[PDB]
């Protein structure tokens, strides 16, 4: 129970990878405060799966791209729990299109949620962590941020951006004993991959030395490592969890 | 005359590194189309220095963060020169602050000029280069995009973003023979640099000195020429050994 | 105990970081097989510390640069314990000098122990792991393998080489479900660290964002992560444990 | 003529990429001193092609894995041309095999030539370059040194090692203004379907492409670049 009584904030906790991160942290003893934006019922369900592990949990609506929402979100976290030991910046979206026809709003929305939202949530949690002289920030990037991917210029830019932001953050907060790292998932069995056709899946599997999509638990286990004392001398790093796709 | 007959578009060409890029490309025979945003007098100085090399040059006012300005800019470039063979995305700004104190405006302005502007200009030039089945795009990043830097969350995010965008662009445009690369300057002597801050910066550079705008221009020229035709999706650090 | 019943081979396990890796893996329930050279005294101390955790342990004399020694070492590991679940390639030496002054034997000795030793041990364990359709290899590199270091051309080349070899190995063994990763330590405390001049310590700590040397437990914890189910979708990676020295 | 009056030493100059590096440097006005090991007839052909550009050229037998050969090679280079301005460490071999079947000799031969050879030549040229307070060293790596490649554990280890060595050399020699960099070729056409699929540009590169990257890193055009690896691989590794 390596996180017993820690307080973890998880953005995008209402479903997918974020829900499984919340549950995994709860399994290790962390109390959870997470957000949702468009899915209230999904948040109820995360909250019940988390509560089964005997920790305290609270959900709150917040759009991470909106500074006002992010400010109220962290204020309430601190009101409820007094501290934030772990922040997981997991909220993210895709709006895939060829660069040549990519719409300005497809660009803006992905940059604003994925990159700016991570900046906003980092900014809002920074003072509490600096006063605590302790904290872990885990940003959710993607291995395509490392290598590029046709049809995803906005997403790639946002995730490469997050990796750069992770480094600056790590440099700024390191003197107060705060670890800041990123996880870079490859292709994980999720709603994203559930929508794909056989030819597309086949070509994706061919890029993975292990020959299979990862699981949400693989990603949660990386976040857990980076949220715990087991990684206390690691900062400013991106951990790729991608079956060998990017070496 | 490595670029004789070529047309190069340079964003941020009115001063500094962009001015020296434009002059260097002109010295190799390229006609230059470049933008300015708030410095018409500087733009006219650049134009004169470019024209001295025997090529044609035009400057046009445009904000690279604004989609409508970018569309008009590239429209006018094609009306003036008939084609675009080289795009150098050099326009960029900084609005430094500790991340805990960084204002939403400081974040947005830097992301929109440095990163969105590079996207918009790349998008604008892409169909033209695809039709030509030839082209070079050189994006200006920074070594702080590679390693991070305290006080520059926005700038670092934008430049690391540019590096990723460079790679996606290279992938999308490679089937039509277009090269797409990035140059990552370290500490370069300019008006902006010329404290104890300087001595601490020098201690980070194995060569022991700031670089010159000509060093950066020379990297850009290499990546814009036939000498680098099998190079794509790469970032070239021009930093005196600061980041290895 | 997350490695209950596993067998770990740790090269260089008789002292320093190697010893602390062997002890950490023993505390998670792994039986330990390790090599030594010269006097058995350090090896005797390691075996004692390991056995206090209630697992089985055997030391064997073997020089990792020597093919014959390696062959016999792995044969005896199989004879003694049945299988090899984890291999930690930690054997390593330095012979520092500026390039101008570096002797040919100083070059060869370091390349042979650090790089060739990793190759020979990897080769020796590979058929066993392939047959098992399971296994973890963790190679010990160094952050100077990533960025270079004056006076260490041989050491740097060897550890950079080890990082490349890690990637080839991961590629060749991925189809049998074997994970292969590297750990890159930064500046880690030894019992001489405290004795250094203040000027010396300050110049080293200036290069580290976290502002302190790491511990051998920090390194052992990263190895443990990479030897466990928690990292089963991670392969071909180098994990830097360096307080942010290299980002 | 960017390199008029310069003296370039090229290892592995008798064939393939090294031959074209030598020619390209000559084209820019450099005198050329290069080695061969097993191919004197190919070395004569290289020398004739270099001599077309009006520069002086000499070939000399040397195994870069042998310290005595390397010392004599560099000694003769200095005797012949007075100085060395540029060193290109291009000699290299492959001896492929799956890790589990790879022989100790296949490992040793590739490490000794590709990595130890680059160390030995770098060591030999370093004193004269330091005394000059000028020089350029370009090492030949490979993109598989960056990402790994099944069947090539020896080659990959050797080239990844060269990249690390490049960084150390760059740091040790930067105080006297010597630039040290590496070129990492992808698939280059030398003397199919699956290789091409991995290259975004959709074609193998040419020896001229590699030669042009070497020339850039050997010239004043790159004087602020050191400790870098330039991948010339049609986008294979980004
Ligand atoms: N799936 C993969 O294979 C994969 C690969 C690489 C990286 N990743 C990264 O891992 C993270 C999670 O991915 P996923 O596949 O689990 O995505 P998902 O299933 O779509 O879940 C996304 C989560 O983010 C939240 N979210 C979206 N927009 C938001 C906004 N404006 N404000 C606040 N929250 C918002 C959603 O909340 P609501 O639904 O309540 O709005 C939801 O809980 C993402 O950052 C993604 O880029 C995933
Ligand atoms: N100096 C260095 O050491 C260094 C290091 C790393 C990276 N870089 C990068 O290299 C590039 C140029 O650097 P520099 O030092 O030469 O910069 P600089 O002298 O400050 O010039 C910046 C240029 O960007 C233009 N610009 C500003 N806002 C704009 C907008 N909204 N739309 C269009 N153009 C705009 C300016 O034109 P107006 O004056 O007309 O507005 C100006 O010509 C930048 O991308 C920079 O980030 C420089
Ligand atoms: N071709 C590619 O696609 C590719 C890809 C990645 C990297 N590279 C690298 O680029 C470099 C050139 O390769 P290449 O394809 O052009 O090979 P190559 O010329 O066909 O043959 C290797 C060259 O190295 C010399 N050589 C071999 N062993 C030697 C020794 N012990 N001492 C001295 N010289 C020796 C040979 O000389 P003799 O014939 O006289 O013995 C020959 O000139 C190599 O380092 C290679 O690893 C090439």
PDB file of C-alpha atoms in Angstrom, chain A residues 65 67 97-104 107-108 111-112 115-116 119-120 122-123 126-127 130 144-153 156-158 160-161 163-165 167-169 171-173, chain B residues 65 67 97-104 107-108 111-112 115-116 119-120 122-123 126-127 130 144-153 156-158 160-161 163-165 167-169 171-173:
ATOM      1  CA  UNK A  65      -8.784  24.300 -21.121  1.00  0.00           C
ATOM      2  CA  UNK A  67      -8.530  28.745 -16.412  1.00  0.00           C
ATOM      3  CA  UNK A  97      -6.941  15.169 -40.122  1.00  0.00           C
ATOM      4  CA  UNK A  98      -4.364  15.575 -42.867  1.00  0.00           C
ATOM      5  CA  UNK A  99      -2.195  18.628 -42.222  1.00  0.00           C
ATOM      6  CA  UNK A 100      -3.112  20.135 -45.593  1.00  0.00           C
ATOM      7  CA  UNK A 101      -6.824  20.393 -44.702  1.00  0.00           C
ATOM      8  CA  UNK A 102      -6.653  20.577 -40.899  1.00  0.00           C
ATOM      9  CA  UNK A 103      -9.180  23.040 -39.634  1.00  0.00           C
ATOM     10  CA  UNK A 104      -8.154  25.838 -37.275  1.00  0.00           C
ATOM     11  CA  UNK A 107      -5.859  22.507 -34.203  1.00  0.00           C
ATOM     12  CA  UNK A 108      -7.018  24.831 -31.400  1.00  0.00           C
ATOM     13  CA  UNK A 111      -3.737  22.227 -28.312  1.00  0.00           C
ATOM     14  CA  UNK A 112      -6.003  23.846 -25.743  1.00  0.00           C
ATOM     15  CA  UNK A 115      -1.180  21.169 -23.883  1.00  0.00           C
ATOM     16  CA  UNK A 116      -2.707  24.279 -22.338  1.00  0.00           C
ATOM     17  CA  UNK A 119      -0.008  23.894 -18.176  1.00  0.00           C
ATOM     18  CA  UNK A 120      -3.070  25.243 -16.308  1.00  0.00           C
ATOM     19  CA  UNK A 122       0.465  22.352 -13.306  1.00  0.00           C
ATOM     20  CA  UNK A 123       0.334  26.098 -12.545  1.00  0.00           C
ATOM     21  CA  UNK A 126       2.519  24.228  -8.067  1.00  0.00           C
ATOM     22  CA  UNK A 127       2.171  26.433  -4.957  1.00  0.00           C
ATOM     23  CA  UNK A 130       6.153  23.892  -3.244  1.00  0.00           C
ATOM     24  CA  UNK A 144       3.757   9.712 -31.392  1.00  0.00           C
ATOM     25  CA  UNK A 145       4.966  12.908 -29.719  1.00  0.00           C
ATOM     26  CA  UNK A 146       8.442  11.387 -30.036  1.00  0.00           C
ATOM     27  CA  UNK A 147       8.313  10.235 -33.652  1.00  0.00           C
ATOM     28  CA  UNK A 148       5.480  12.058 -35.427  1.00  0.00           C
ATOM     29  CA  UNK A 149       2.430  10.454 -37.048  1.00  0.00           C
ATOM     30  CA  UNK A 150       0.739  11.426 -40.296  1.00  0.00           C
ATOM     31  CA  UNK A 151      -2.884  12.580 -39.810  1.00  0.00           C
ATOM     32  CA  UNK A 152      -2.152  13.787 -36.264  1.00  0.00           C
ATOM     33  CA  UNK A 153      -0.157  17.048 -36.552  1.00  0.00           C
ATOM     34  CA  UNK A 156       1.682  15.219 -32.066  1.00  0.00           C
ATOM     35  CA  UNK A 157       2.435  18.906 -31.519  1.00  0.00           C
ATOM     36  CA  UNK A 158       0.433  18.897 -28.293  1.00  0.00           C
ATOM     37  CA  UNK A 160       5.692  16.781 -27.932  1.00  0.00           C
ATOM     38  CA  UNK A 161       4.749  20.074 -26.273  1.00  0.00           C
ATOM     39  CA  UNK A 163       7.083  16.488 -22.991  1.00  0.00           C
ATOM     40  CA  UNK A 164       8.916  19.874 -23.255  1.00  0.00           C
ATOM     41  CA  UNK A 165       6.608  21.326 -20.595  1.00  0.00           C
ATOM     42  CA  UNK A 167      11.127  19.230 -18.504  1.00  0.00           C
ATOM     43  CA  UNK A 168      10.646  22.912 -17.660  1.00  0.00           C
ATOM     44  CA  UNK A 169       8.309  21.982 -14.859  1.00  0.00           C
ATOM     45  CA  UNK A 171      13.535  22.171 -13.512  1.00  0.00           C
ATOM     46  CA  UNK A 172      11.326  24.752 -11.779  1.00  0.00           C
ATOM     47  CA  UNK A 173      10.001  22.419  -9.044  1.00  0.00           C
TER      48      UNK A 173
ATOM     49  CA  UNK B  65      -0.871  33.667 -35.633  1.00  0.00           C
ATOM     50  CA  UNK B  67      -5.168  32.438 -40.376  1.00  0.00           C
ATOM     51  CA  UNK B  97       8.061  34.024 -16.385  1.00  0.00           C
ATOM     52  CA  UNK B  98       8.167  31.388 -13.689  1.00  0.00           C
ATOM     53  CA  UNK B  99       5.422  28.916 -14.505  1.00  0.00           C
ATOM     54  CA  UNK B 100       3.493  29.519 -11.229  1.00  0.00           C
ATOM     55  CA  UNK B 101       3.230  33.230 -12.243  1.00  0.00           C
ATOM     56  CA  UNK B 102       2.892  32.901 -16.032  1.00  0.00           C
ATOM     57  CA  UNK B 103      -0.239  34.661 -17.272  1.00  0.00           C
ATOM     58  CA  UNK B 104      -2.693  32.973 -19.613  1.00  0.00           C
ATOM     59  CA  UNK B 107       1.159  31.433 -22.590  1.00  0.00           C
ATOM     60  CA  UNK B 108      -1.323  31.971 -25.436  1.00  0.00           C
ATOM     61  CA  UNK B 111       1.971  29.236 -28.363  1.00  0.00           C
ATOM     62  CA  UNK B 112      -0.052  31.032 -31.041  1.00  0.00           C
ATOM     63  CA  UNK B 115       3.617  26.927 -32.750  1.00  0.00           C
ATOM     64  CA  UNK B 116       0.263  27.734 -34.371  1.00  0.00           C
ATOM     65  CA  UNK B 119       1.316  25.125 -38.407  1.00  0.00           C
ATOM     66  CA  UNK B 120      -0.580  27.754 -40.395  1.00  0.00           C
ATOM     67  CA  UNK B 122       3.111  24.932 -43.225  1.00  0.00           C
ATOM     68  CA  UNK B 123      -0.551  24.271 -44.037  1.00  0.00           C
ATOM     69  CA  UNK B 126       1.715  22.412 -48.444  1.00  0.00           C
ATOM     70  CA  UNK B 127      -0.616  22.134 -51.486  1.00  0.00           C
ATOM     71  CA  UNK B 130       2.744  18.869 -53.189  1.00  0.00           C
ATOM     72  CA  UNK B 144      15.587  24.581 -24.888  1.00  0.00           C
ATOM     73  CA  UNK B 145      12.911  22.646 -26.759  1.00  0.00           C
ATOM     74  CA  UNK B 146      15.108  19.581 -26.208  1.00  0.00           C
ATOM     75  CA  UNK B 147      16.105  19.964 -22.544  1.00  0.00           C
ATOM     76  CA  UNK B 148      13.692  22.396 -20.938  1.00  0.00           C
ATOM     77  CA  UNK B 149      14.509  25.714 -19.288  1.00  0.00           C
ATOM     78  CA  UNK B 150      13.248  27.315 -16.067  1.00  0.00           C
ATOM     79  CA  UNK B 151      11.197  30.461 -16.705  1.00  0.00           C
ATOM     80  CA  UNK B 152      10.252  29.550 -20.275  1.00  0.00           C
ATOM     81  CA  UNK B 153       7.439  26.980 -19.990  1.00  0.00           C
ATOM     82  CA  UNK B 156       9.848  25.430 -24.452  1.00  0.00           C
ATOM     83  CA  UNK B 157       6.388  23.908 -25.007  1.00  0.00           C
ATOM     84  CA  UNK B 158       6.116  25.820 -28.285  1.00  0.00           C
ATOM     85  CA  UNK B 160       9.240  21.126 -28.486  1.00  0.00           C
ATOM     86  CA  UNK B 161       5.827  21.340 -30.193  1.00  0.00           C
ATOM     87  CA  UNK B 163       9.931  19.690 -33.293  1.00  0.00           C
ATOM     88  CA  UNK B 164       7.020  17.236 -33.143  1.00  0.00           C
ATOM     89  CA  UNK B 165       5.154  19.133 -35.866  1.00  0.00           C
ATOM     90  CA  UNK B 167       8.261  15.171 -37.792  1.00  0.00           C
ATOM     91  CA  UNK B 168       4.541  14.827 -38.640  1.00  0.00           C
ATOM     92  CA  UNK B 169       4.990  17.237 -41.537  1.00  0.00           C
ATOM     93  CA  UNK B 171       5.910  12.143 -42.788  1.00  0.00           C
ATOM     94  CA  UNK B 172       2.926  13.676 -44.641  1.00  0.00           C
ATOM     95  CA  UNK B 173       5.013  15.421 -47.300  1.00  0.00           C
TER      96      UNK B 173
END
